[PDB]
Amino acid sequence: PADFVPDSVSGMFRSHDFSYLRLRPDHASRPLWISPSDGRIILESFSPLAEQAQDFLVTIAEPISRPSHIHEYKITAYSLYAAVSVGLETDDIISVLDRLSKVPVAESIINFIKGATISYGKVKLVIKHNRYFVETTQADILQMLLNDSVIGPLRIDSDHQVQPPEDVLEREEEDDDIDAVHSFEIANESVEVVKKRCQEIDYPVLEEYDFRNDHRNPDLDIDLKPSTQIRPYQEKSLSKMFGNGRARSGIIVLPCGAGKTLVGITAACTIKKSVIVLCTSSVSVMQWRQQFLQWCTLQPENCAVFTSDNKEMFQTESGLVVSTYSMVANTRNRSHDSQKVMDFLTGREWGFIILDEVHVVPAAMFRRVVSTIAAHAKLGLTATLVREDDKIGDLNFLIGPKLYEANWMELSQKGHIANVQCAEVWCPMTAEFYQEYLRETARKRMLLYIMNPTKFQACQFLIQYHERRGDKIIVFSDNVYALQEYALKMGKPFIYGSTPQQERMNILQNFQYNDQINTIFLSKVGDTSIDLPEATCLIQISSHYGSRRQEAQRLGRILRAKRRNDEGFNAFFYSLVSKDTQEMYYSTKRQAFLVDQGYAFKVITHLHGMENIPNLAYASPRERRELLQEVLLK
Amino acid sequence: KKRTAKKNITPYQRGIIRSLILTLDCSEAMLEKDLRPNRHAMIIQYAIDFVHEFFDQNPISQMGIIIMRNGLAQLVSQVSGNPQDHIDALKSIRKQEPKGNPSLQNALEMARGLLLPVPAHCTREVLIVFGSLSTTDPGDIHQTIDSLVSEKIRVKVLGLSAQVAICKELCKATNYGDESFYKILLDETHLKELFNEAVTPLPVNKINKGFTLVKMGFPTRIFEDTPTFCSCHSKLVYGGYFCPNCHSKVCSLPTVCPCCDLMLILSTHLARSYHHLMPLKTFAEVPTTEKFRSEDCFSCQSRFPXXXXXXXXXXXXXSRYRCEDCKQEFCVDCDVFIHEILHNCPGCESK
Amino acid sequence: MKFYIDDLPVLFPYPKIYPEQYNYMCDIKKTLDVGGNSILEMPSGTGKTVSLLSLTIAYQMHYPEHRKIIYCSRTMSEIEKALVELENLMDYRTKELGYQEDFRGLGLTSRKNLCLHPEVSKERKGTVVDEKCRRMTNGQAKRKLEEDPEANVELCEYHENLYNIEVEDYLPKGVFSFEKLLKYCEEKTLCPYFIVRRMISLCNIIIYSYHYLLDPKIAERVSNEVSKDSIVIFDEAHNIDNVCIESLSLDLTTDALRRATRGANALDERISEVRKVDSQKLQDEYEKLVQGLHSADILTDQEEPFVETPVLPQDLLTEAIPGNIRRAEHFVSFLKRLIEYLKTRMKVLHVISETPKSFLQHLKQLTFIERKPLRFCSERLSLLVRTLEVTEVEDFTALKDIATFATLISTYEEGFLLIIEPYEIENAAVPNPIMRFTCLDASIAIKPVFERFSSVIITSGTISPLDMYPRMLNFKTVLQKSYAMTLAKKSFLPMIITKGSDQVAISSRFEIRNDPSIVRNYGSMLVEFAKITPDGMVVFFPSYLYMESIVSMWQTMGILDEVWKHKLILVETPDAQETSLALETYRKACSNGRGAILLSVARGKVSEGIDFDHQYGRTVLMIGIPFQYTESRILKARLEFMRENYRIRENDFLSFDAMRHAAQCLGRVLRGKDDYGVMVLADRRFSRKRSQLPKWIAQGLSDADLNLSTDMAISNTKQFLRTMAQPTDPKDQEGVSVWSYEDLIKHQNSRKDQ
Ligand code: SF4
Ligand SMILES: [Zn+2]
Ligand SMILES: [Zn+2]
Ligand SMILES: [Zn+2]
Ligand SMILES: [Zn+2]
């Protein structure tokens, strides 16, 4: 395989002892408590360099715990690659951390810290005459470059040449490290094996991307305008990928629907070569290009939206294109048009591929297409930390070292979705919910507790409260017929199942532009995928919504940027869940999920004057049972 | 290396009779984040602490507050000796967020008129909270500075972490040519000492001027409860004071009676001035080799004062900061308090 | 203050001293003991001319041989800076010693800057004012008023009285600066130009710019009595070679040939119409050609000369006959043939490179004028024009410039190159061709300066590196000593802003136009500093053409929108009076409460002589590193000669002058030791050019200030604004580098004499 597990070693290396665990020598004189056993850096308030330890630890590790006084750290195996790129010294990281953190630097923690600072994310790759050579930036890389089976064995004895480095660059190593060092030019066969030998020895390399030195690929028709929006999480993903001088390829997990592709297109502009965008599914290609990409300076007519059912121009574009994995290689090959793109992707030397939510598509096709396509570099703009695409070939080492992580706590607190007040509404029970819980336990009951009139009335508090507050109210309900029955009573336009698209955006038109209509009831038609709206109060009614990885994507998706800060809590979330019903387990999974995602959590069970709110239809227990039998039809 | 007062403040003359009007600034420059909450919220509180201490150390003075918003000079409290009204105005200032830029010349024009009703005996002073890097002068600001120096209106400005010549020229010009009031701030504690140094009088060189012999009164207490009344506020005052001359009731305060217009002070105004006029010499740390004192304190009982034959502990220092004339040792913590609130040296008094 | 250099009692004017001066003053005396040139990188933040003059002021009262001095600078602005500071020094000398100064020094600029007649002073251009005063009193025009009364010829009324009363002694006792000389001469009906032009032979110290010691048309009044045994100081001598390049350069245009043909035709009438007026006066000057080069009445005159000589001062010019062109009519013969030959040599296919000797040979076959006769045009034109008592000169201005080229072409060769581009590359493919001629070896004018001079001093605080100067100009130095600013406080932050808010490499090398990937970062830099920085911000763009697109496209977006409200912005403009009005309204704003920002050009006039004190500058921004490759291959042709005659390549020459230009602009922000301020520089290549920065600045640029973020640099200047603005005056750490009055210098420097 061309990927190594070292990009995803996270989730392990969190375990210590008491008699086995050694008491920290720095505990007597040290501000923080960085115990290598638990993988934590408990930075106390007395630290002389508490911010520095977080900066050094943040670059190299992941802080699992976020207490006000003392913090905690989580296992991050990929942090060696990111920690190496940041610049933390191999000895320097341990020496400062051991002295500052009270927990003494353990051999495994120090060796990994010593390895992470230098060996992790500090590989050596040479290049001569604007090409790839069998060498490295340092003396170790020069021995490493010649010691590679493809880097060294597949290398010509000539140190460097203008024609070979420009053309040939055991294939053209454009995923090499910093050039202008001792090396010797290489052959042009097997970058597949070249990235296979790197991962087996587990050597995370600080790769470069020298587009200007590649004569085989001409300069493509790219309309270089950065006029697209730039956002606090977007520039550093550019900056860290670009670094100094040449750019590189890697994994940058981003919020979907928050201009995730914006870094890639701007990164595509800088490299000036063949770039393609891969999306989750074909229907997303047109919907997402129509939802934000018009303001973007990318060219819709040149970026042929590959769908395999509607036909555009292919194998003929002089510039960039936008497609999906399903269009690339899946059972969703509607015709031979998709396979014709795949054949052209081999004859054309494609240097950059933008990925949008790879996790939905299994990675097995990712390796199949790469070998035939003969790609130079890639970019996987995923969203989820845990995924099914952790096969033998890790997409991190398949593409390159990670640069920036989807720090959702940064974007849900900086003004877009700041002050995330997650709630789970426990609507008061009654006889029929208890009658329905005992009689039947099948999943057909999934809508027989959703139909709670107090849930709708609990929503109606959020309807009246947030419209009075000038906020935005979003309701999530995978059902259709019962959801349609909901908002007719309150007599307002509302999103519903199989809504006409022009009407729903017209409902959205009164939603985020006008304040009188502010409640929108998104169905399962929302994902995947449609325009994820600006979120100020999100209501989720369906709580199973398999699987949990979809929930992380859906939680990040609908909860979107809100450019409004009047209230102290400018981003509400509510989980209207009937209690003493089946959704106890499903809701309690969400309750742990939101707090584990980092968002602030609360429980809203007592509305301000619950029984005095308007539209008291079906409030009495008798009327609620009648609707439950109507929902039996669904 | 020792950081204390150099030799001694020679007790001849200090300014107790004064009317210091601080000019705050609520400008979009103060919206820029330098302090912990922001520039605007933090400075107000340290001025709030400044006001009470200014009344604490200079109770025979009056206070005024000036704010600068949107390039306009705005007063929130007239020059007066009322601590609570000044804070109340600052709360509304605290409640609001800054906007615009400061207007130096308008404040200087405001300052000249504002201290015109200030009496001759009260030493004129205007405190400028100037933090931004620009002003708004609708005329010749060099003319008004020429007016304040000619009319004997000294100006001390409290600049933020920025240095401007016009403010430095303003400090130099008004203060009888002296350029020693241009200290700036860089920290939470750093800005407070500028206010705290403004709490104490500011002598550099007092010139020979026509001194005024002024008349002032001492009030008398009241005790009535059911007959609760006062002739100053005309409210239900269950306790107050009385001028010996006008027999017009006033609340329990140093408030000047509104009938015969003579200054009223109870005990603090004369006494708070007395400790300011004649400060004693600072209790410098007496040498450990030249201590010749017992292992304890004298003003209080601090037995800790000698490590004795303990390497880098012995030959260090000692809690033996002794007063000069009194020749009595005292701990550094104690001897600091000896010159912090009340001078009241034990060895000097115990004679 | 009165300290010694073991032989010189120095009457130092500042009560406090600066160790960099003492290091400068100690070694500069050794240069005076054993003659050299002694490039000394004296700090510019320190007062360089304060001890530069004061030591030399004490030089004359002790050393009795060097009765004359030369102070030469790039602009008259630094001449008067010397004048204003030195004027106090002479009065400071009288304050301590009594009456022992006996010093005379006046600035020499021109007729334009020192004219007092309201009729003459109206005009703006100096030459027109120079022409009006010269025609007001000319060796052939002013005689036509005294002998016969007329309204055609007026009188200066100030040269008239100078001709009567001023040239009998020296000015009474004042050491007049530009401001002081203007005031004195206004009330006493005198024009200050004719004083100092005559005062060359009487000034114990002579004050004039670099041109009047180097430029051949104006340096004909140089006196060996003030040149043989004198001491010469070159102030801001970093821009010395560039001036010499212009001295032997000249362009032409297709419009000018129409004027040149006008002058050729109009003078043809002029010389012929006066023939019937006085034909014997015409021929009388012909017998003046056979005898010699007209020496009796071409050089021994008070006012007569009209045509300037671009050749070296009369040494590189034979005195033989100028061919058979003696006749007035026959003068027309070769004039019209040569003007036609140059026109087809003005419409050349493209830039062609021929040795200027070969141009004479190609001329020789088309128009048979031998090289030796053609060298005599300059003294010919004055010999002929004087006879015609010409009254109209407008179309004749082309005659003096073309004939200036005629003297140059027949005399200079194998060091220069002739080029004729058919158009300007920025406005290519048009009938606007140039007779391009530019100087390739500046040392031809430099060497004769060192040929006669014995005491010479070269000093500049921006020269970096200091080693190519002796090899470029071919002069002998002995004391190459460098100075680093030793202070107890930083007071300056040279910055290497490679990465901006986008963290993208910023420069101006990529193009000479605007682009959203680049322009949004520079503007975001300007606004972010405008929020925080204190009053006084000066920037120096690489070129003025670059800035016009920069500001106009800045106006398109709302990036300046917040910059509008922060400070007061005044722009550098092609007209000098407006920019001086812009700059005079910049300094007042900076001193006043409101903040101000100035924008200028690295190659502009601002970087030449302008100073910026505390208020006038606190944070200076440098958009990129200025490369002067924008123009046509003229400089490429110029650069080739430097590559083979000297071992200085394009890469070494380009960056080292660019940083020299960069270091020239930066140091203006600091005035004294007390002065402080950040000097930010924004280009990626500034990482590599840390070597080209001056050692005093380069030392301040540690390896930790490379490729900073500008927002971090905002924090860096935020910390600078927090730290430096503090009135930190410990007064005990001063004495290490402040050397309080007459105490620590005598105490400590005796330990330094080892
Ligand atoms: S006489 Fe003197 S002042 Fe008058 S125009 Fe001539 S040079 Fe100028
Ligand atoms: Zn009352
Ligand atoms: Zn009274
Ligand atoms: Zn005492
Ligand atoms: Zn004590």
Side-chain angles (χ1 to χ4, degrees), chain C residues 364-412:
Chain C
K364 168 173 180 54
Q365 302 308 312
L366 297 195
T367 308
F368 280 80
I369 286 297
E370 290 294 76
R371 184 169 190 254
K372 297 292 116 174
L374 197 56
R375 292 142 53 90
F376 307 148
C377 62
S378 300
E379 53 90 10
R380 164 64 195 181
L381 198 52
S382 182
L383 176 142
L384 75 94
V385 167
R386 210 180 56 197
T387 62
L388 340 162
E389 55 274 343
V390 186
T391 171
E392 168 167 356
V393 220
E394 57 104 37
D395 32 354
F396 295 160
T397 59
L399 297 181
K400 69 166 80 74
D401 303 341
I402 301 289
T404 274
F405 181 83
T407 307
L408 293 166
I409 183 66
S410 189
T411 315
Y412 291 93

Side-chain angles (χ1 to χ4, degrees), chain A residues 224 226-227 230 235 239 243-244, chain C residues 499 501-504 516-517 520:
Chain A
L224 191 147
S227 305
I230 199 177
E235 55 91 8
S239 167
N244 56 335
Chain C
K499 307 175 186 174
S501 180
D502 53 4
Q503 311 300 145
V504 160
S517 60
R520 201 166 79 259

Side-chain angles (χ1 to χ4, degrees), chain B residues 297 300 331 334:
Chain B
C297 176
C300 51
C331 46
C334 150

Side-chain angles (χ1 to χ4, degrees), chain B residues 230 232-233 239 250-251:
Chain B
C230 66
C232 63
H233 303 80
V250 70
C251 290

